Design an enzyme around this catalytic site. Structure first.
Site, PDB file in Angstrom:
ATOM      1  N   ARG A 146       0.821  -1.207   0.000  1.00 14.60           N
ATOM      2  CA  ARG A 146       0.000   0.000   0.000  1.00 14.60           C
ATOM      3  C   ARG A 146       0.861   1.266   0.000  1.00 14.60           C
ATOM      4  O   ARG A 146       0.546   2.241  -0.702  1.00 14.60           O
ATOM      5  CB  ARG A 146      -0.990   0.000   1.174  1.00 14.60           C
ATOM      6  N   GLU A 167     -16.080   6.213   3.298  1.00  8.78           N
ATOM      7  CA  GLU A 167     -15.396   5.734   4.489  1.00  8.78           C
ATOM      8  C   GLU A 167     -15.791   6.479   5.769  1.00  8.78           C
ATOM      9  O   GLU A 167     -16.447   7.530   5.722  1.00  8.78           O
ATOM     10  CB  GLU A 167     -13.868   5.735   4.283  1.00  8.78           C
ATOM     11  N   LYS A 182      -2.489   6.828   1.232  1.00  9.52           N
ATOM     12  CA  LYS A 182      -2.408   7.222   2.643  1.00  9.52           C
ATOM     13  C   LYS A 182      -1.466   8.416   2.802  1.00  9.52           C
ATOM     14  O   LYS A 182      -0.309   8.262   3.219  1.00  9.52           O
ATOM     15  CB  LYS A 182      -1.927   6.044   3.502  1.00  9.52           C
TER      16      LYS A 182
END
Lengths: 340, 340
Positions: B80, B219, B183
């Protein structure tokens, strides 16, 4: 003035002898000081690094014909930084603190303010960052405000010149209700990849459209778009997702009060580009970047010329830079002499 | 194990004796080292500070019943971070480098890995930042990769407990074609103000909807949403604007392979909340945060209960945490022993 290749500076970092730095702790800013240390020493857990709690400004100091140096509308940068701080839950830097700090940096490094008339200037970069220790997403309770400086070149040595830009609809620099109207790193990070895409197709930058519908122009990289119609109107995009540049407001102002043009913030539809006889980008670093052509899908739209720059753009550029460098009478309240 | 108030740690920064740090210069990462210095020393002109060129991860080390410590799927965090780096034009940290670094930090601070069975863990925060000198928006050519650690508490001492969340349509944490699936700090900065709004109305956090149309759930703060239907299906939102959590993929996996449930990433419409008999948020820090009710406009929608947590949520929580802490047999390739 020291001895640098003034005309051939571009726009890049230089480490100058002094920067201003001020720390916020316990709900208060300290008075600020000059430091010779160009390295920031911050917690590994600083919110500026983890949660993007950071903001910056950009403004120039200009040497005038008699040798004196001045700032151009730094009150506007201070107010924009205050709104940017609010959006990111950072404490505001008051306007008097901001302007005083900017002046201290110019004075401390005055020999780096390029000679009149290189068209070169001393670029100031104020930065406001959340520091100290934070691991769960939350604003800092410690902050740094710093202003450092570097001499930057004209960029239009050879006169104003048009460049081409790309509309690329699969990237947004900001969300419809995101941080687009705030000068924060997050918007710029999002622009790195589309910038690279534009550059590899030999465009200067990307022109972004409104993130909701992608039918109206937002901005040209980090700079504002403006168009001139056949009826000599000045039109610039208005969205709550757009960063409002000091240069845009100044151009709006001068277009009306110096040139008698209708000057408005309105929407600019990508399907009506023929509405504009001239177009450009405006901003502190850019000043005015004339747009030759814009690529959108198959189509390449040329407003005025791919090689020459339009008369109205020329007139606005001459008047704005004249005011900044002190060769043209300024509107009231715009010029801040560095020794005042 | 040293002597800390293990059960009453929350989730916050602690300065532990050692962190890992590695520098990227001249197109290469160095081998990395442990350092005792919790202060980063970076250029005032670092792109992480001006242009949001920064990314982080979060993963936990778990002490098992025999005292040994293990990581949970850190290969997934590494992959990720690699995709996040690509999006921001940062050089990738290879998976073997990432996992080795994580292990070095756990081993160097092993006495801070909480005792079995506090439900407490050693939280690792890898951080990847653009440093060095950059003034015009552009990627760095120098980078820091660091992993620091801190013990964090169970958060569900007293058992799983539901909390309430707010859908507030005038904020986006990410653009439709922005950095939402990466992120990076920019997404979190955008979330500071809506977070505060939620908190002041006594909600835990905001549930964000899709930025284009605002009709589908994206989210829950920085965590993923999941719902359980009456036909025992596990459904979690899929959007290119959503950060894919390791916890979500793990829950998807366990729901199917342990519980025989249909487990899919599909859209979740805000107008069909009655489709779900249970709902929660999932993530590394959160594990599972059961959702009691969701406020949207006038309406307050309760899936299961405002005070009790549903059976399926309980079953998934028990199985996932059991695997993480080593009390339940793991899927192949998930567990990485720290001394291996």
């Amino acid at each position: 003035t020291v001895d640098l290749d003034w005309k051939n500076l571009g726009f890049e970092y230089h480490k100058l002898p002094f920067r201003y730095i001020s720390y916020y702790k316990d709900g208060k800013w300290d008075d600020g000081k000059l430091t010779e240390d160009a390295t920031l020493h911050i917690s590994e857990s600083s919110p500026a690094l983890h949660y993007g709690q950071e903001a910056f400004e950009g403004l120039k100091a200009y040497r005038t014909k008699d040798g004196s140096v001045q700032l151009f509308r730094p009150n506007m940068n201070a107010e924009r930084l205050q709104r940017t701080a609010d959006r990111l839950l950072m404490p505001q830097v008051p306007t008097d603190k901001f302007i005083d700090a900017a002046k201290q940096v110019v004075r401390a490094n005055e020999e780096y303010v390029p000679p009149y008339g290189t068209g070169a200037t001393l670029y100031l970069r104020p930065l406001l960052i959340g520091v100290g220790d934070v691991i769960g997403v939350h604003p800092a309770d410690e902050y740094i405000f710093t202003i450092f400086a570097m001499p930057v070149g004209n960029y239009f040595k050879g006169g104003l010149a048009p460049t081409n830009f790309l509309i690329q609809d699969d990237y947004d620099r900001a969300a419809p209700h995101g941080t687009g109207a705030a000068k924060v790193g997050g918007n710029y990070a999002a622009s790195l990849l589309p910038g690279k895409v534009a550059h590899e197709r030999q465009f200067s930058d990307v022109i972004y459209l409104d993130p909701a519908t992608h039918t109206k122009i937002e901005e040209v990289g980090s700079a504002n778009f403006f168009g001139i119609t056949k009826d000599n109107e000045f039109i610039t995009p208005l969205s709550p997702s757009i960063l409002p540049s000091v240069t845009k407001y100044s151009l709006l102002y001068l277009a009306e009060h110096r040139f008698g043009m209708k000057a408005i913030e309105g929407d600019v539809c990508v399907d009506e580009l023929d509405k504009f006889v001239e177009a450009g980008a405006c901003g502190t670093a850019a000043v005015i970047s004339p747009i030759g052509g814009v690529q959108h899908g198959d189509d390449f739209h040329v407003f005025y010329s791919e090689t020459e720059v339009g008369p109205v753009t020329h007139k606005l550029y001459d008047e704005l830079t004249g005011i900044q460098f002190g060769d043209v009478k300024a509107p009231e309240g715009w010029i801040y002499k560095v020794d005042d």
